[PDB]
Ligand binder design. Sequence first.
Ligand SMILES: *[C@@H]1O[C@H](CO)[C@@H](O[C@@H]2O[C@H](CO)[C@@H](O)[C@H](O)[C@H]2NC(C)=O)[C@H](O)[C@H]1NC(C)=O
Ligand SMILES: *[C@@H]1O[C@H](CO)[C@@H](O[C@@H]2O[C@H](CO)[C@@H](O)[C@H](O)[C@H]2NC(C)=O)[C@H](O)[C@H]1NC(C)=O
Ligand SMILES: *[C@@H]1O[C@H](CO)[C@@H](O[C@@H]2O[C@H](CO)[C@@H](O)[C@H](O)[C@H]2NC(C)=O)[C@H](O)[C@H]1NC(C)=O
Ligand SMILES: *[C@@H]1O[C@H](CO)[C@@H](O[C@@H]2O[C@H](CO)[C@@H](O)[C@H](O)[C@H]2NC(C)=O)[C@H](O)[C@H]1NC(C)=O
Ligand SMILES: *[C@@H]1O[C@H](CO)[C@@H](O[C@@H]2O[C@H](CO)[C@@H](O)[C@H](O)[C@H]2NC(C)=O)[C@H](O)[C@H]1NC(C)=O
Ligand SMILES: *[C@@H]1O[C@H](CO)[C@@H](O[C@@H]2O[C@H](CO)[C@@H](O)[C@H](O)[C@H]2NC(C)=O)[C@H](O)[C@H]1NC(C)=O
Ligand SMILES: *[C@@H]1O[C@H](CO)[C@@H](O[C@@H]2O[C@H](CO)[C@@H](O)[C@H](O)[C@H]2NC(C)=O)[C@H](O)[C@H]1NC(C)=O
Ligand SMILES: *[C@@H]1O[C@H](CO)[C@@H](O[C@@H]2O[C@H](CO)[C@@H](O)[C@H](O)[C@H]2NC(C)=O)[C@H](O)[C@H]1NC(C)=O
Lengths: 324, 324
Amino acid sequence: LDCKPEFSYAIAKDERIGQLGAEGLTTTWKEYSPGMKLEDTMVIAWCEDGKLMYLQRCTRETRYLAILHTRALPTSVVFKKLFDGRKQEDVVEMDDNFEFGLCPCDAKPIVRGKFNTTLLNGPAFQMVCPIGWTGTVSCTSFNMDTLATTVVRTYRRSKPFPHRQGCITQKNLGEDLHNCILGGNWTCVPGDQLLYKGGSIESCKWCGYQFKESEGLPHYPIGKCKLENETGYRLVDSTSCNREGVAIVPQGTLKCKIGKTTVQVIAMDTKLGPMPCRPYEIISSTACTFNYTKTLKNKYFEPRDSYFQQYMLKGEYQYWFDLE
Amino acid sequence: LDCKPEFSYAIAKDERIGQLGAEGLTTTWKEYSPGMKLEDTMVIAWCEDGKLMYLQRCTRETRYLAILHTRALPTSVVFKKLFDGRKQEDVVEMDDNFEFGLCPCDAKPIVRGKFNTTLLNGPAFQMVCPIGWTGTVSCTSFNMDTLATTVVRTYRRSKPFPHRQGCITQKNLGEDLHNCILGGNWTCVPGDQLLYKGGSIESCKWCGYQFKESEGLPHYPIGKCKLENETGYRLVDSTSCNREGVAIVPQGTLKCKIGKTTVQVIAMDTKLGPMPCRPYEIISSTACTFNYTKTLKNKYFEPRDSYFQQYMLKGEYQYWFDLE
Ligand SMILES: *[C@@H]1O[C@H](CO)[C@@H](O[C@@H]2O[C@H](CO)[C@@H](O)[C@H](O)[C@H]2NC(C)=O)[C@H](O)[C@H]1NC(C)=O
Ligand SMILES: *[C@@H]1O[C@H](CO)[C@@H](O[C@@H]2O[C@H](CO)[C@@H](O)[C@H](O)[C@H]2NC(C)=O)[C@H](O)[C@H]1NC(C)=O
Ligand SMILES: *[C@@H]1O[C@H](CO)[C@@H](O[C@@H]2O[C@H](CO)[C@@H](O)[C@H](O)[C@H]2NC(C)=O)[C@H](O)[C@H]1NC(C)=O
Ligand SMILES: *[C@@H]1O[C@H](CO)[C@@H](O[C@@H]2O[C@H](CO)[C@@H](O)[C@H](O)[C@H]2NC(C)=O)[C@H](O)[C@H]1NC(C)=O
Ligand SMILES: *[C@@H]1O[C@H](CO)[C@@H](O[C@@H]2O[C@H](CO)[C@@H](O)[C@H](O)[C@H]2NC(C)=O)[C@H](O)[C@H]1NC(C)=O
Ligand SMILES: *[C@@H]1O[C@H](CO)[C@@H](O[C@@H]2O[C@H](CO)[C@@H](O)[C@H](O)[C@H]2NC(C)=O)[C@H](O)[C@H]1NC(C)=O
Ligand SMILES: *[C@@H]1O[C@H](CO)[C@@H](O[C@@H]2O[C@H](CO)[C@@H](O)[C@H](O)[C@H]2NC(C)=O)[C@H](O)[C@H]1NC(C)=O
Ligand SMILES: *[C@@H]1O[C@H](CO)[C@@H](O[C@@H]2O[C@H](CO)[C@@H](O)[C@H](O)[C@H]2NC(C)=O)[C@H](O)[C@H]1NC(C)=O
């Protein structure tokens, strides 16, 4: 129903009309206002403009609204029931996208469940992205004198939630993007690393050396490589950090160049082998004239010398020759 | 009977006195000399005391002495029979030293034997180095009236002549020494070249090029090689004058060396190989400097470039490199 300009209103717990008037009032009478509001310990209620509304502020006892025309007789009071009255204890199965929770009887939540995924604002409470959640939250309360304590209402989740609104489901552990197995924003219980489905890429990391462009590598992209918009690295390819006896590493022993990047490399074997990377510092010194560079045991950089149609190789250095 | 002063004497074959003299006369009449001698092709006589004595120089024709008294009629001569005219024949086996032949009755020899080995000086003849000859010369004689013809004596050699101290048994052709199967000085009917059983060589000939010294060959000596007492070459070996895909000839196409000697040489193939023979002229041309020479497509002379531990080959030239 609604409220009307010329009536008195009050609330009541039972309709019992005693001799003198309404017997079971909880409140004092109240004459109309466009936005009048009425108040007790089991309910609040309100009129807009133009309409009767309420918000049960606990639910153990049953409450009816009393109404009595301002002039009319006390024993003439009329009751429409606003919420039913029952006790004790509950369960509320929380729907797949249940988010904002709200306990009743100024009662503090107790959280049993799989993981942490909660925001407690007093007896209010909230599931922040509990994707993959199970547990049961019981709004209990404790008596200080007697150390007994008891619950009003349980909210059950036997089946795990699925995904939802703005629930970020990918975290950085160090520099690597990692999945979120369960939960979303900050309840991320992280998983396996993210694999590269595709995308316009900015940067590749391999063997502990970070590259921009296709140039020099067995293929591009390779190693692990991160997107422009994003923060961390997605897996791609675990190509081994060795290129036929010559392995590329942090530490030593001579420096060549891939694409634009510096690189250190050490040789594992001493047989004839191709250096993977283009070389660093090419030093010259026509009669016969010759450029050369430093190398490893038996390892040849391209290009071959045209003149001797071959890679030309003392033992430490690889040479190139022009004869006039 | 006897020769007296008041007579003339001559000799006759037939006892015939025809009209105007004797007919059978093989002389001109000889006036008495104390020591007159009469001579013809059958017999020769002499008067020593006035008594007569003669020595037949052949048997076949029967002869007389003619005697005409220096006054007398020609038609009155007389004759004494000096000796009879038996026509018999003999046969003669020549000593192993047999050397010089002699037919009798002014009789042409005609010769049957193995080869050419005779000098013919009318009715006498000569065997020049008849080494290993066999045959029969026979001193035949014609008659133009009767067209029969006959021999007086056959000289036989059934068994072949051995060699005989004074006969040269090896002929020189080109610069090659050659045996005489049959003959000696200029009757040499030559044979195979001489095999070199041993002795000091002055010069070897291999592949059309003359070597003095053991240096730079499979061994020494080799090919064909001529001794210090001699004039031409005895065969020793015939090592193939093509060497590991590269062959050595008169004309073309570049000149390497062995011992002190020049050698022309052509390529048998292209697939890599070893020469063998040092090279002609090494042309030089400080930082790096480089000596080199010309060569054969993929063929290398010794020694390698030490500095690269390998053979050093652009395509027509072999190089050696100095970084000091
Ligand atoms: C469960 O999740 C939240 C994550 O945000 C944690 O909230 C913090 O709780 C600590 C209590 O130890 C408080 O001091 C902070 O006020 C909260 N911080 C933030 C950023 O929210 C909560 O503690 C987690 N539960 C744990 C770690 O047991
Ligand atoms: C998880 O985080 C994201 C990003 O911070 C949240 O999405 C933004 O939330 C703000 C509110 O502050 C709104 O303006 C938009 O909905 C988002 N921002 C923009 C620019 O679009 C998301 O709501 C978070 N989820 C939680 C906390 O559960
Ligand atoms: C950065 O960019 C990639 C590639 O565009 C983003 O991937 C998008 O996100 C959705 C799912 O969240 C994918 O299905 C689509 O492929 C992408 N959408 C569009 C419109 O391109 C990725 O999420 C971004 N990473 C961030 C913001 O960290
Ligand atoms: C050795 O280094 C020199 C530089 O001093 C190279 O010189 C190049 O040679 C060409 C002609 O052959 C010149 O026209 C260019 O100006 C030079 N190019 C560059 C990129 O500098 C020489 O070719 C080098 N030899 C090698 C790499 O074997
Ligand atoms: C023995 O004597 C004569 C004269 O020397 C040889 O006659 C030769 O025979 C050839 C036939 O091949 C004729 O053409 C010539 O009349 C002769 N030629 C030469 C080169 O002598 C006879 O053959 C001699 N016996 C030989 C050479 O073995
Ligand atoms: C071949 O010719 C030579 C000389 O022109 C002859 O020489 C004689 O023979 C011996 C060899 O036994 C040589 O030592 C001497 O030159 C000569 N010796 C004497 C003792 O005079 C050789 O006999 C000739 N043979 C012929 C033509 O048949
Ligand atoms: C040059 O010397 C050789 C080797 O010595 C001579 O061969 C000799 O001759 C006889 C046969 O005539 C061989 O059986 C012997 O081997 C050699 N005899 C001696 C004593 O060494 C060859 O005849 C000579 N060549 C000439 C003179 O032209
Ligand atoms: C290139 O030719 C010259 C000859 O002019 C060689 O130089 C000689 O070799 C030694 C040591 O190698 C040098 O010390 C001398 O100056 C030269 N000696 C004589 C006697 O000339 C050079 O070694 C040759 N390089 C080659 C063949 O690779």
